[PDB]
Symmetry: D2
Subunit: 477 residues, 4 copies
């Protein structure tokens, strides 16, 4: 059970300012807790404190930044079940998927702990011509300054971690705005950070609705905005950011290709397709939305995938036997069911699932979806997948690329040539081979091209964005 | 002598579309040549051709990109004197400084030739926890796509090279808009590239005035805008760029510190201060504008710097004995002379030089300039320097940092502690030790923080910005 | 108190084979414990088991190797005081220096834990010319195979750790022979490793006297010999090693230079000189043996160093107020006192200390030692230091280099030029600036040139030596 | 035609000391030239001069080392046909293969030119724990010192280049002993180097027979021996080398696997198998000796390979239509024909070729060769290949590994799983996919494990071996 109320964190300190943000249990619909909602005055105060903490943060030695991160790792391990249960409530996340997220939260912070003590530089040969005889270069990474972080509803812990943990490793103060539907995970991160010896102003965690969050984008005291969320929002915020650096982690309509040589592997393939399409009710930025299957294996794959989809239990996410929990809201279920209805009216067929009861949307598989349909081209963000057929690998690649988006794609194949062609031709951040696009391991470079992002996360890459190189050129004569 | 007319380059081809852009000899004021001016229809056509060339460019093997760059190097060596003389005319650049720029143009292209065949990736351990057993990552750099390049008047060849050469190494088509006051250097680069086997649309070089250049910032078919020019313009273009990545190389009011231990080195220090403050008439983004001298050596430095400044010959830049050529225009000379007059009226003193005859602005040294004056705080971009005194090194560092800007700074010292403190505390892209901030070698990371830039040039760093990483995750079971 | 007896570790298992190796308390001289001594049959069996464990070790995933190392870290933290007290007894090491070594043991294993999950490779551009169009390279590091490790008496824990920890990170089975005078630390490492899930044959820890240890050098089933010990032994073993790779970590007569600018820093300098010369009774491979002091500060340094040397308490290493413990044996004290006597007979002067009572050799400072004396040129390995004067920095560098050896040197200076010159000219593995040569941090590359070594330790560098690169060249057509 | 006589190069200077080494045309058998043979007095003088050149070489700036290498590249391009014709004569190398070697000589020197200006170091975080607060590390690569180089007969130019070019890039003086059967290529390299501004003693090129070459291994003034040649010699020299570092590039009995999925690719596979087995008469350290073909494609591959082998013209290597030139001597042809006869007597069958006329050994293919035969297990080094069959991929890998050797192997496959398994399991330096093991590109890491080598060549890797790291540790307080 969640605590009755939660504070926000203003310049490292818990402030029980109000109880104005109600957070519901996404399965029962009951109010599960109330948290303090930050207004513009509080946001402004947090930003000023972050400016004031910039020098103290920059002066922390590497091993001290590591020690802060290690304290977080230890506390997250100690509170593992509490954290997983909180995710289950506030995100409606099936308990096995919630435990999966807490395991990843720990991985992300542990990678950051390791990277905090290996932010190395280079000794550069500058003697490339006679004019530069006797010069040598030395590099270091300096913290960029105060960072503005905005995170989405669907991984309340780990996607905040992908900003918070590298900021601490890099030596940047930050102000984090979690999603209002799922703020508790970030507030527990804040609680744990408040136990450490960080300078005042090193961090704030401030719940705020989007309509009250302008300063997170526009305030000129932030030197970086790093936003994870919908493409419609992220590209709009880039336009308003001003001088600061912008990093965007957005969405897409990810595809998985199943090649002709997969007959003897179909039970594995189907298990992974069902995971990617339907885990956490399809609410993943790399959830499987489109499945392109080679004609040689299409019928066998279809039959097994219909049976697998029908087998997935929907219900209370606290029950470990539940695979499909509630979607995040009835309004989001209605968005997706409208797209599904429109695809069917235009000729598509529901071949497994299809029933929708409020936010309880069954795992659903469709055939014959037109490539012009919203269900095909927009980001479904729910427990639906589209199955389509191809006859030659080039056509599968073209159809994956027939999208505004480009986050990840997956290919199940034993062909070396097809693996190489996919790497060459798929206009995505990441191509996964012999697993779904929905796979991520927390050290890997991660992000999108096209409308799906601008930049990469994963600890090393976030540290790079959160620092500025400073060159020392030394002339000897 | 320049050719009578020059074409522009539209999708690799010379087009003598008109003679509407007059280019003056900046010393005599006479029209030296006329070049074709691109309109919006031509700019749009160039962008479409760049889209069409994206796939052919991406498919060029590394050694073929290298061969294009090597052809450029060979031709620039063959045409060395022609190129230097063209710079002398169109930029009013003293012939020794013009030869210096051509030497650097060759360095920049040679570094790019070397880097074109070493765009390596990583094999990443992904087995950081049990969930990721059997996964491995492989990385590559993919060209970002069509690039929009805008360059300034003062290094007509080398600052274009810092965009063009890495684009070719990385496999990106590009459209370059040179400065209208100095377009010839870029058009000679275009002429040389037109001799190579590049696919149609690989490059365009299009003169256009700023008021006709909106598409270089706003067109959504470009995936990167890389702008080198004034801070007032660059920050405004970032706001209008839309989704594309933005790189900015801007300006500043660079300082050099002369430490207490420099008495026996003062003739060297003074020679370098005069170079940094007055070469190419102070028209460098890292020209020395402010000189902070320790009280122990202030008087001796002052005396030598007055004598050195008075010794610098001003006149015809074609004469190898000329040190100070014309400024780029009478209007720019009038801007700077107005700031100088205002500083004097407020209490400053001209201690060497000070005479202004049209665009012929003498090398000038001032004392007693208030830190609130435009001459102190804005970008002088002319042959003036301000001398000021300090008593302890911390105060010198604070005064360097007392600026909107942060491009480079220099420190003449033999103190290891002061060298370390400068690297820690100077909020600049680069700190130069025992030379002026005006030093750059073309492989080094180069750029500004604060209002002076966003990102780095130097070949390796430009290639990074002109590419997207693409991860291949391979699962073995 | 040590346990009454210790086993050896044969293919991961404790074997109480005999009690034939007596280990004395180096202060009291009493037998403190008895340990099992391995004969040739046991050594041969260990090597065969290491061969048999090669494939299982190579197949362990990275995170499992990390988990083994993490178990060691946790157990060493839990047993910190026990480990420090054991060092105090078996090595006669002052308790503060013993705690220092255990702290370093933990650092070494923690660095190895981090490095175990970042043994990355490269994706290499191979398209350097037309013949190689369509080829790409991919690299990995494969364990070299069974490793033979030999460690010395003076850091019974940490110098074994610098071989054991990287071997585990790299996936190599190993057989370790500790020093017979100080085997207990290695046997506690073995005890802790025996608690982990490693495959049988992953490790053996076998006490054996040098005269029974031929197989550690000659057996052809080992693919690497890594030896830490005296130069006279190491160079002789290289000759007998056969086909295997050889890494040598040897000794020297390390020097510290004190520059002319150090007057206001002399109390710091003297504190560090006394640490480097006299900690663990001078029994460090990078102990300060020679002190070169600039004429400007010589007298002031001399006076302070005489007073500091006289202040160092000699006695029972279990007492935290003891600075100078016993030397490792009376025979080693007699070796050094003979060299000291010979230097005095030839004209040197003892200016502080000089009294020798069995293995209790006082911290001692000499002046006027001829550069031809054994005390100058050979490895003292005891609590003596020689002070000499210089007038110009070039002469100090020449005198540091006037040696068979080249491990580390130190320079106390604030001159940037002198720092640069020292890095250029000192023929050593490592140059330390503003600390003694006796400083090491366990991640840094570490080793000697000239007669002082061949190769580097420090975790990353040891992993490199304990692996073979394996290139995959893939041709696409 | 070769020149009538050639000098040797002693400390950069041509010395026509004698004409005692006759070099034959390996096709006609006539003496083609006579070269000066170095005695022990000359070898000793060269070594002393290399010691004397160590400091001047170390002080050369990077761009000057690059300029020396660039001069070599330009001269080799200018003299391309001369160099190829000399190889044709002294090595009996078919002119197309000789031109191939000269092309590679240029690649090797060009890679070295590029690498000479990018010998970078690292700025290392040393703040891993509180003891190391305020310390930072900086690295550089220092030349190791004088190098001893020994090269073999079969690539008279390029295998010398793989030692000479990195030595120059790294700043090491060297003494090169080419093969007495083929010294001319190395003497032309020496002639070209003698045109450059290198300090006296930077290089010597000294022909000497093995029985007069002891000092190349034993002299203690060399700090590295790098040997390319037979395994029987290389392992013996390691035993005699003393203190110096040893690098070995040796031989093997390389295998190519043809997988079940290759039917539609067999003409390509057969073309590459014939190249690898029979180019330069099989005289390659990575020549194809063993061909393992999957049962599904065995008969079709066999038929095509018999026809291809029979089609290869044997004769005068000056004729561009000749594929198979003479072997290096009649004695080497007799060695191999004896092994072939013994394999046939034990049950093997010659299925194509088999005729031997002096040094003219036809391209030959055998079936049914016992795995215990010398022809199978020893290094053939001539134009013979053995064909054998397998039914499952694991067995093919085991049979490749059933050898004393481990240089390179090749696998023709479209299976991703088999590619991965080959990389995991083949105990070789390099695994080539979709080409023969006989492929090398001159920048790639290259060398053997097991009895085939110790260390890697390829420019970057040779530079690493020819340098020592020197760490600078700087403490700030
Ligand atoms: N690339 C990646 O790593 C991932 C990206 N995503 C993407 O996130 C989306 C789903 O998450 P969801 O939370 O619904 O996304 P939203 O874009 O609706 O919201 C994301 C965050 O942005 C905030 N926000 C919205 N508008 C503004 C604004 N004008 N100013 C400031 N903050 C604002 C929200 O605040 P509030 O809601 O409190 O009003 C929330 O904190 C999908 O598109 C998905 O692909 C998800 C996970 C992975
Ligand atoms: N890994 C690699 O890069 C390559 C290795 N090789 C290997 O080289 C061999 C073929 O070449 P080959 O020339 O016949 O090899 P050898 O081993 O017969 O001779 C190689 C070189 O070593 C010299 N040499 C031989 N014995 C001594 C000695 N005691 N002291 C000093 N020098 C000595 C030879 O001198 P001289 O002949 O003048 O008496 C020659 O210069 C094969 O085993 C092949 O695999 C070949 C090419 C590639």
């Amino acid at each position: 059970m969640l605590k009755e109320t939660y504070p926000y964190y203003l310049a490292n300190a818990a402030v029980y300012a109000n109880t104005d943000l109600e957070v519901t249990d996404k399965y029962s619909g009951k109010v599960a807790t109330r948290v303090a909602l930050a207004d513009a005055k509080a946001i402004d105060a947090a930003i000023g404190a972050a400016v004031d903490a910039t020098k103290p943060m920059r002066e922390l030695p590497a091993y001290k930044r590591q020690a802060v991160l290690d304290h977080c790792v230890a506390r997250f391990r100690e509170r593992f079940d509490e954290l997983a249960e909180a995710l289950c409530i506030e995100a409606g996340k099936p308990i096995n998927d919630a435990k999966g997220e807490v395991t990843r939260l720990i991985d992300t912070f542990r990678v950051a702990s390791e990277e905090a003590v290996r932010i190395d530089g280079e000794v550069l040969n500058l003697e490339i011509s006679a004019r530069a005889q006797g010069y040598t270069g030395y590099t270091r990474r300096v913290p960029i300054g105060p960072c503005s972080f905005i995170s989405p509803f669907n991984f309340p812990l780990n996607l905040a971690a992908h900003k918070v943990a590298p900021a601490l490793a890099a030596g940047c103060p930050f102000v984090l705005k979690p999603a209002s539907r799922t703020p508790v995970g970030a507030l527990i991160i804040g609680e744990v950070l408040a136990e450490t010896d960080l300078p005042k102003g090193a961090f704030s965690v401030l719940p705020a609705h989007r309509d009250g969050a302008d300063l997170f984008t526009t305030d000129d005291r932030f030197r970086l905005l790093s936003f994870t969320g919908s493409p419609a929002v992220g590209w709009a915020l880039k336009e308003k950011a001003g001088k600061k650096k912008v990093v965007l982690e957005l969405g897409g309509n990810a595809a998985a290709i199943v090649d002709a040589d997969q007959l003897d592997r179909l039970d594995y393939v189907v298990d992974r397709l069902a995971f990617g399409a339907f885990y956490q009710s399809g609410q993943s930025c790399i959830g499987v939305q489109r499945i392109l299957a080679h004609a040689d294996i299409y019928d066998a794959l279809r039959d097994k995938l219909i049976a697998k989809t029908r087998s997935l239990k929907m219900g209370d996410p606290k029950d470990p036997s539940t695979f499909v929990g509630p979607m995040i809201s009835e309004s989001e279920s209605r968005r997706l069911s409208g797209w599904m209805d429109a695809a069917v009216a235009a000729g598509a067929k529901i071949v497994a699932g299809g029933k929708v009861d409020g936010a309880m949307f069954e795992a659903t598989l469709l055939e014959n979806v037109g490539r012009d349909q919203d269900l095909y081209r927009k980001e479904a963000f729910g427990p639906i997948a589209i199955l389509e057929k191809f006859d030659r690998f080039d056509d599968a690649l073209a159809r994956v690329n027939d999208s505004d988006f480009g986050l990840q794609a997956g290919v199940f194949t034993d062909s070396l040539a097809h693996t190489q062609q996919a790497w060459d031709e798929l206009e995505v951040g990441g191509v996964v081979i012999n697993d779904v696009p929905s796979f991520r391991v927390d050290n890997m470079p991660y992000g999108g091209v096209k409308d799906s992002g601008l930049g990469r996360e994963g600890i090393r890459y976030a540290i790079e964005d959160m620092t500025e190189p400073r060159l020392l050129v030394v002339r000897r004569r």
